[PDB]
Design a protein around this motif. Structure first.
Motif, PDB file in Angstrom:
ATOM      1  N   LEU A 119      46.721  34.691  31.184  1.00 24.12           N
ATOM      2  CA  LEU A 119      45.325  34.541  30.820  1.00 24.12           C
ATOM      3  C   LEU A 119      44.521  34.261  32.077  1.00 24.12           C
ATOM      4  O   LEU A 119      44.540  33.150  32.607  1.00 24.12           O
ATOM      5  CB  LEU A 119      45.165  33.413  29.791  1.00 24.12           C
ATOM      6  CG  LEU A 119      43.753  33.031  29.362  1.00 24.12           C
ATOM      7  CD1 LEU A 119      43.001  34.213  28.772  1.00 24.12           C
ATOM      8  CD2 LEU A 119      43.847  31.887  28.362  1.00 24.12           C
ATOM      9  N   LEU A 120      43.846  35.297  32.556  1.00 27.84           N
ATOM     10  CA  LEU A 120      43.128  35.244  33.818  1.00 27.84           C
ATOM     11  C   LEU A 120      41.703  34.810  33.508  1.00 27.84           C
ATOM     12  O   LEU A 120      40.942  35.541  32.875  1.00 27.84           O
ATOM     13  CB  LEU A 120      43.189  36.610  34.518  1.00 27.84           C
ATOM     14  CG  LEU A 120      44.629  37.089  34.782  1.00 27.84           C
ATOM     15  CD1 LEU A 120      44.711  38.599  34.890  1.00 27.84           C
ATOM     16  CD2 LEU A 120      45.182  36.442  36.049  1.00 27.84           C
ATOM     17  N   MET A 121      41.366  33.598  33.927  1.00 26.47           N
ATOM     18  CA  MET A 121      40.133  32.942  33.499  1.00 26.47           C
ATOM     19  C   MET A 121      39.244  32.604  34.669  1.00 26.47           C
ATOM     20  O   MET A 121      39.699  31.985  35.630  1.00 26.47           O
ATOM     21  CB  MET A 121      40.447  31.641  32.762  1.00 26.47           C
ATOM     22  CG  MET A 121      41.337  31.777  31.585  1.00 26.47           C
ATOM     23  SD  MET A 121      41.930  30.158  31.046  1.00 26.47           S
ATOM     24  CE  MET A 121      40.386  29.275  30.800  1.00 26.47           C
ATOM     25  N   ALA A 122      37.973  32.977  34.578  1.00 26.24           N
ATOM     26  CA  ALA A 122      37.013  32.639  35.621  1.00 26.24           C
ATOM     27  C   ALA A 122      35.766  31.952  35.055  1.00 26.24           C
ATOM     28  O   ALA A 122      34.796  31.713  35.771  1.00 26.24           O
ATOM     29  CB  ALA A 122      36.625  33.885  36.388  1.00 26.24           C
ATOM     30  N   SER A 123      35.789  31.641  33.767  1.00 22.95           N
ATOM     31  CA  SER A 123      34.581  31.197  33.101  1.00 22.95           C
ATOM     32  C   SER A 123      34.847  30.212  31.959  1.00 22.95           C
ATOM     33  O   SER A 123      35.994  29.878  31.669  1.00 22.95           O
ATOM     34  CB  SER A 123      33.807  32.417  32.580  1.00 22.95           C
ATOM     35  OG  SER A 123      34.557  33.101  31.595  1.00 22.95           O
ATOM     36  N   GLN A 124      33.754  29.753  31.344  1.00 21.23           N
ATOM     37  CA  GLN A 124      33.783  28.896  30.156  1.00 21.23           C
ATOM     38  C   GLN A 124      33.013  29.552  29.019  1.00 21.23           C
ATOM     39  O   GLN A 124      31.860  29.940  29.185  1.00 21.23           O
ATOM     40  CB  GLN A 124      33.167  27.524  30.447  1.00 21.23           C
ATOM     41  CG  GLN A 124      33.973  26.709  31.401  1.00 21.23           C
ATOM     42  CD  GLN A 124      33.199  25.543  31.946  1.00 21.23           C
ATOM     43  OE1 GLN A 124      32.528  24.824  31.202  1.00 21.23           O
ATOM     44  NE2 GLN A 124      33.265  25.357  33.263  1.00 21.23           N
ATOM     45  N   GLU A 125      33.649  29.672  27.861  1.00 21.78           N
ATOM     46  CA  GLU A 125      32.957  30.194  26.690  1.00 21.78           C
ATOM     47  C   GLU A 125      31.984  29.159  26.125  1.00 21.78           C
ATOM     48  O   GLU A 125      32.170  27.959  26.319  1.00 21.78           O
ATOM     49  CB  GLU A 125      33.982  30.615  25.620  1.00 21.78           C
ATOM     50  CG  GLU A 125      34.783  29.455  25.045  1.00 21.78           C
ATOM     51  CD  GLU A 125      35.877  29.907  24.097  1.00 21.78           C
ATOM     52  OE1 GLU A 125      36.005  31.126  23.875  1.00 21.78           O
ATOM     53  OE2 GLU A 125      36.614  29.039  23.578  1.00 21.78           O
ATOM     54  N   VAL A 163      45.667  31.368  34.413  1.00 26.89           N
ATOM     55  CA  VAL A 163      45.380  31.459  35.833  1.00 26.89           C
ATOM     56  C   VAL A 163      43.894  31.202  35.959  1.00 26.89           C
ATOM     57  O   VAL A 163      43.080  32.053  35.604  1.00 26.89           O
ATOM     58  CB  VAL A 163      45.767  32.836  36.421  1.00 26.89           C
ATOM     59  CG1 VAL A 163      45.502  32.878  37.903  1.00 26.89           C
ATOM     60  CG2 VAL A 163      47.249  33.122  36.153  1.00 26.89           C
ATOM     61  N   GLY A 164      43.551  30.009  36.431  1.00 27.65           N
ATOM     62  CA  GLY A 164      42.166  29.607  36.571  1.00 27.65           C
ATOM     63  C   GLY A 164      41.683  30.072  37.912  1.00 27.65           C
ATOM     64  O   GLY A 164      42.310  29.791  38.922  1.00 27.65           O
ATOM     65  N   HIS A 215      34.150  27.842  37.980  1.00 29.25           N
ATOM     66  CA  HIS A 215      33.611  27.990  36.630  1.00 29.25           C
ATOM     67  C   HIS A 215      34.685  28.191  35.575  1.00 29.25           C
ATOM     68  O   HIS A 215      34.376  28.213  34.389  1.00 29.25           O
ATOM     69  CB  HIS A 215      32.616  29.144  36.578  1.00 29.25           C
ATOM     70  CG  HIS A 215      31.342  28.850  37.301  1.00 29.25           C
ATOM     71  ND1 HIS A 215      31.169  29.116  38.646  1.00 29.25           N
ATOM     72  CD2 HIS A 215      30.189  28.283  36.881  1.00 29.25           C
ATOM     73  CE1 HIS A 215      29.961  28.740  39.013  1.00 29.25           C
ATOM     74  NE2 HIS A 215      29.342  28.232  37.960  1.00 29.25           N
ATOM     75  N   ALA A 216      35.938  28.322  36.001  1.00 24.11           N
ATOM     76  CA  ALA A 216      37.030  28.483  35.038  1.00 24.11           C
ATOM     77  C   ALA A 216      37.103  27.274  34.099  1.00 24.11           C
ATOM     78  O   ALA A 216      36.816  26.146  34.495  1.00 24.11           O
ATOM     79  CB  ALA A 216      38.354  28.680  35.766  1.00 24.11           C
ATOM     80  N   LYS A 262      52.800  27.094  32.067  1.00 22.87           N
ATOM     81  CA  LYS A 262      52.422  26.597  33.391  1.00 22.87           C
ATOM     82  C   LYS A 262      51.113  27.203  33.885  1.00 22.87           C
ATOM     83  O   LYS A 262      50.907  28.407  33.770  1.00 22.87           O
ATOM     84  CB  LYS A 262      53.551  26.898  34.378  1.00 22.87           C
ATOM     85  CG  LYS A 262      53.244  26.586  35.826  1.00 22.87           C
ATOM     86  CD  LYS A 262      54.477  26.838  36.684  1.00 22.87           C
ATOM     87  CE  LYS A 262      54.250  26.392  38.113  1.00 22.87           C
ATOM     88  NZ  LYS A 262      55.495  26.552  38.911  1.00 22.87           N
ATOM     89  N   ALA A 263      50.230  26.379  34.438  1.00 26.79           N
ATOM     90  CA  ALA A 263      48.965  26.901  34.945  1.00 26.79           C
ATOM     91  C   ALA A 263      49.044  27.205  36.429  1.00 26.79           C
ATOM     92  O   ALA A 263      49.739  26.523  37.174  1.00 26.79           O
ATOM     93  CB  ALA A 263      47.841  25.927  34.686  1.00 26.79           C
TER      94      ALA A 263
END
Ligand SMILES: [Cl-]
Length: 209
Positions: A123-129, A154-155, A159-160, A176-177
């Motif tokens: 889960l490739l994350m760069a933001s917040q919903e 994966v933050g 902004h993740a 694991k993050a």
């Protein structure tokens, strides 16, 4: 016949269903999103992609999820990589992790007809919903946990959604993050991430007869 030989000596040859979930928000610029896709393609080159070995899915998520590749798509690995490389930049105001985990739980791993494979969602994350969209977040993560779908967040960048990443980590020990400062750090973490998820998956038994 759609088999292709490995491009590299570094190659995961295990029984694995691997789902790439790509943040489609504007927190990544078009140029950064290209780096994110290049990372996904680099990881794919290091998998033995086949219905009998590693299967891959690629989903871009904004306020909704769009699958470009499904696990059952019988295409050459090179064609799958080309498809991933051409995933369109969305640059959405919203990228919903809750929606894409729901998609993973109820559309990708709805029917477990490959019980012999480990199941991993990167889960490739760069933001917040928006918080309004997160009511069921923990429930979807737990639903995935119960199907032994390992979620590896994966933050990327400040902004993740680190609160969600920590929540995911605590649901299962294998969750694991990897927390990175920018997309430019993906390449240097890549082989470690590949090795971690390869190690989670069952080996095929030695060929007989
Ligand atoms: Cl034999």
């Amino acid at each position: 016949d759609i088999s292709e030989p490995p491009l590299h000596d570094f190659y995961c040859s295990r029984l694995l269903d691997l789902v790439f979930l790509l943040d489609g928000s504007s927190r990544l610029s078009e140029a950064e999103f290209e780096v994110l896709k290049a990372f996904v393609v680099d990881m794919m080159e290091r998998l033995r992609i086949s219905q009998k070995w590693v299967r891959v899915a690629v989903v871009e998520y904004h306020d909704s999820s769009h699958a470009y590749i499904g696990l059952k798509d019988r295409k050459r690995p090179s064609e799958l990589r080309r498809i991933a490389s051409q995933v369109k930049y969305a640059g959405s105001q919203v990228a919903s992790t809750s929606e894409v985990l729901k998609y993973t739980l109820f559309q990708i791993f709805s029917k477990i007809d490959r019980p012999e494979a480990s199941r991993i969602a990167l889960l490739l994350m760069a933001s917040q919903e928006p918080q309004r969209m997160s009511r069921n977040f923990v429930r979807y993560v737990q639903g995935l946990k119960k199907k032994k779908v390992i979620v590896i967040p994966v933050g990327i960048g400040p902004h993740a959604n680190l609160k969600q990443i920590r929540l995911i980590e605590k649901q299962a020990p294998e969750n694991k993050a990897f927390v990175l400062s920018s997309v430019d750090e993906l390449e240097q973490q890549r082989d470690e991430i590949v090795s971690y998820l390869c190690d989670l998956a069952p080996e095929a038994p030695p060929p007989t007869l």
